[PDB]
Amino acid sequence: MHYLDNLLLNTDSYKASHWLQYPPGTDASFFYVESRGGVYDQTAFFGLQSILKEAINRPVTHADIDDAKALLAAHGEPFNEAGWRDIVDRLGGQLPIRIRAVPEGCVVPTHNVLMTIESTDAKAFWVPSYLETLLLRVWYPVTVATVSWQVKQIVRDFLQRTSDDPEGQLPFKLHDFGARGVSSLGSAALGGAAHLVNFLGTDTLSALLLARAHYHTPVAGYSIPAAIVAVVSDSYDIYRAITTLREEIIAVVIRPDSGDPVDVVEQCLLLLDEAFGHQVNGKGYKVLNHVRVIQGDGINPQSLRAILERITAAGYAADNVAFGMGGALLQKVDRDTQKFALKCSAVRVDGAWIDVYSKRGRLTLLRDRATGQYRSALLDEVATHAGDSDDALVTVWENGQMLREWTLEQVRAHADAARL
Amino acid sequence: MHYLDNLLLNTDSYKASHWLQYPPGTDASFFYVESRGGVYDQTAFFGLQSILKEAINRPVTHADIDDAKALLAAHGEPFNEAGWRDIVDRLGGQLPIRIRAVPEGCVVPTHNVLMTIESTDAKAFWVPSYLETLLLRVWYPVTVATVSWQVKQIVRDFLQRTSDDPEGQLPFKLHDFGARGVSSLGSAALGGAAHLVNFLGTDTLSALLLARAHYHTPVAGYSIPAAIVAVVSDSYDIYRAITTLREEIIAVVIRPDSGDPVDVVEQCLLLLDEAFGHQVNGKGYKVLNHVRVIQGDGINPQSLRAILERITAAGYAADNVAFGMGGALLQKVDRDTQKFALKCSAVRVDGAWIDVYSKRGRLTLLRDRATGQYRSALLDEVATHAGDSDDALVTVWENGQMLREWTLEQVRAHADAARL
């Protein structure tokens, strides 16, 4: 809300005091963002566009400066009042930085440069450091998009072995139920949007608002009432049909919440097969008539795979089941899941660039044209050093103006094209 | 930001369709919030006041209804347009609900009623259900406040065995460095504020903005530049002093980030003792002269206790060291950490209350006057059933108006008074 609308106070307390730590006569500073490893060996990049639009949505003002100066003095931190007033009076309150990033949705192996931030004004060289806190939080939409993208690759494998329509079934196979279990409305919106990079099903209305506000997508995702109707049940209740109506369900998705996630799915399949029959698809796997099952409980990339391995062995196609994740998708991730870091790699002393500290200097990302494989390099080795690759970063933000910017449908295109 | 400013879309998709699921002729609905167990056996209650102020900050409008009606139809969910227009035209857009809660900061054992939500209009009985999603997220400030409060009890034990000034040293012994590692600015503000329920040190400027906006506290917490100055070092660097300046540090906190959290603290203590001496306090423990140590790395209630057990055995007072937590405090928690639930326990059929489903009916919380112990009971058994206890809940919100409401200094009073 409005009470957070001051970019000068959207940072760590010690970062306000940080401009005094630079050596004398420094003209510039260079930073980069990377994942230093963790659970997965690649990450789908997403979220930066939303973070820039929301966190940097207006010029800094003298009011912002008055408020920050006052709060931080009583808080115990020095504040560069004169440096910030210079930015407002001389630069119209526009942050003198350049941000380059891999196009959102692209899946990049770990230990690679994903974004770079460089200063564009000699006197306000310290501004990138000031923004470390709000930029580093990009770890969250990247990690959520990565978790979601890794689920997609698992489902896709099994929909490729079974199923006559793998890519037509895949977009509806992981549903977001995370709005209850996420830490804030803003995290529900951003993290839910990161899931929509990979799938179409979501119960996080907050994700539709962010995608339509930041990624130019009026309605990014769909759901059904709980025409396709989901009824919440329990494999014992379905077994008690031994009686009841059936046929008016022939003239349905079942969401269970009772039992081991792997088991109750297998039982629902065997019960609903007895109680609906099946067709045998072109790959030789059974597709239930009329009914499908969504396991929205205890779902994580491990139990996810266990369910699919188990129902595939039993002769049932992966078409029959879809999955739901809540807190395990939007909340049970952290900055160390993908070991995310924002590092300074270069400063300009004297008017001469020097490295900092194995990744040093002014850096970018290269994409090999033949193979599509990513590697990080120094900007001095892009052109006239590589007619075999192109610079993979694009300048998305500079000096207050957002340049390159994506629809959610472009983000999904990059992510859908990447495989493991 | 403004793009989230529609309470009708701050919910789960299926909850919009939820009013059709109630049996015919229902006049009311009763809900309650509790922790069903988890890591700890008690929880410090906090955050509801901020959630109400920010999520329910204005009357619902016909514009909200037009927007929700449109988005949800294209999304795939039914929407009670006529029910919401009734709320705006007949009730001024004020939510017909009553919310009662234990005063914030109070520490309540698990499996106890922490809040209740009851409808106050017969025709709009379904409104509490609509708000389940945004209310249940109270798990996050409660869990963060609980984690922080549990750290406090550990530090307090050791400051009671060592240290001549336990309660004067305790407020500065856990510092929040979580702004980098939390999932959103809003989570940084709310979760950081939950830490300030217990301590005064924070680097999360976002927490000061929320506390001054929602808990009437102009500056809730303090920090130091990194007069008390923190220098970031490394036990090997301190050992290389074997030379250098020392004395102008007599005319300092050391923040290390290299090595096992338990070890490097013990070494820094032994090195700085060699390199500064100590005084022996009234309890017989050594207090270093001039220098202190803050371990802001690898800190969790387990390694926290290990450090204190180790330095206490070595004869050093707990005054000598302070601690820092980042993602382990603000992000590495989830809804299952304290098994948080929002359950419906009573509906009104016919004009007659019936239970739902072991906790059923219209419920409240009692506090025994003699012992201060909490238990949950039915509202029908408060007065003329217990001259030995008082109803422990207070009505904080009703029909659009916030009633009882706290300063952060009142919240801290309740939490500081509770012990394990």
Residue numbers in the entry:
A (entry chain A), B (entry chain A): 1 to 226, 256 to 271, 277 to 285, 290 to 395, 406 to 468
Give passages from the manuscript.
Nicotinamide phosphoribosyltransferase (NAMPT) plays an important role in the biosynthesis of nicotinamide adenine dinucleotide (NAD+) via the nicotinamide (NAM) salvage pathway. Here, we demonstrated the NAMPT-mediated salvage pathway is functional in the Gram-negative phytopathogenic bacterium Xanthomonas campestris pv. campestris (Xcc) for the synthesis of NAD+, and the enzyme activity of NAMPT in this bacterium is significantly higher than that of human NAMPT in vitro. Our structural analyses of Xcc NAMPT, both in isolation and in complex with either the substrate NAM or the product nicotinamide mononucleotide (NMN), uncovered significant details of substrate recognition. Specifically, we revealed the presence of a NAM binding tunnel that connects the active site, and this tunnel is essential for both catalysis and inhibitor binding.
We obtained two apo structures from two types of crystals, namely the tablet-shaped (1.79 Å) and diamond-shaped (2.08 Å) crystals. These structures had almost identical overall conformations (RMSD, 0.3 Å). However, since the structure determined from the diamond-shaped crystal was incomplete in domain A, we focused on describing the more complete apo structure obtained from the tablet-shaped crystal.
